[PDB]
């Protein structure tokens, strides 16, 4: 039931990702199925308050990117070590 608005990452690597997290976002990827993996940037606060729920890790999510909808499921989250924030999320298609 969660709708997560995303964009496509035109840049990647550690420079671009650390630039992207200082701007209060974080990178993510949608892989799985037969399609190519999709690099995605996500707003941070929406996803953090959203993942405070338990249903974020169990229910099918919907990610809106370029006006499409990809029904994914949250595979695996890298968190920051000592701060309450996120590094990265793997989303498997569903």
């Amino acid at each position: 039931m969660f709708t997560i608005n995303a964009e496509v990452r035109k840049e990647q690597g550690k420079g671009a990702s650390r630039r992207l997290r200082a701007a209060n976002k974080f990178p993510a990827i949608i892989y799985g199925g037969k399609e190519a993996p999709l690099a995605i940037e996500l707003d941070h606060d929406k996803v953090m308050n959203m993942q405070a729920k338990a249903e974020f890790y169990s229910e099918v999510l919907t990610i809106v990117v370029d006006g499409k909808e990809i029904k994914v499921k949250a595979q695996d989250v890298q968190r920051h070590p000592y701060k309450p924030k996120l590094q990265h999320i793997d989303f498997v298609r569903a």
Binding site: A54, Y57, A74, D76, V77, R79, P81, Y82
Partner: protein
């Protein structure tokens, strides 16, 4: 006090304490006392903090000490010159980085876990925080 039962060599080099930690999630228990500062922790500080916790949440609960010393720290005596060998093994520390869950606790309410972890984080030299068991 914690100390390895049987080492392989008595004296270790200093080495450095860089980068982030490996034990990061609350694994065994439900609430966790996670490091934020770098530092290192002697066995006396781990014992002091564990007694503060065990007293604080009485003999209910279950507490895991997720760090272990296993690093011998040598000191030279007083009025001894420099040189003439490496010192003697005085105590044992664990090296901590930002992210280590130092302790875990289960079987209490969260408000007692806050209370015992406050009581015991004041016996440690590093800045510390409270974490919960997050699900993936």
């Amino acid at each position: 006090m914690l100390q390895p039962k049987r080492t392989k060599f008595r004296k270790m080099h200093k080495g450095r304490n860089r980068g982030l930690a490996q034990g990061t999630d609350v694994s065994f228990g439900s609430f966790g006392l996670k490091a934020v500062g770098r530092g290192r922790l002697t066995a006396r500080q781990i014992e002091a903090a564990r007694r503060a916790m065990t007293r604080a949440v009485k003999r209910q609960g279950k507490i895991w000490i997720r760090v272990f010393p296993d690093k011998p720290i040598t000191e030279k005596p007083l009025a001894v010159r420099m040189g003439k060998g490496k010192g003697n093994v005085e105590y044992w520390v664990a090296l901590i980085q930002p992210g280590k869950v130092l302790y875990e606790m289960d079987g209490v309410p969260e408000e007692l876990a806050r209370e015992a972890f406050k009581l015991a984080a004041a016996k440690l030299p590093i800045k510390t925080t409270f974490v919960t068991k997050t699900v993936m």
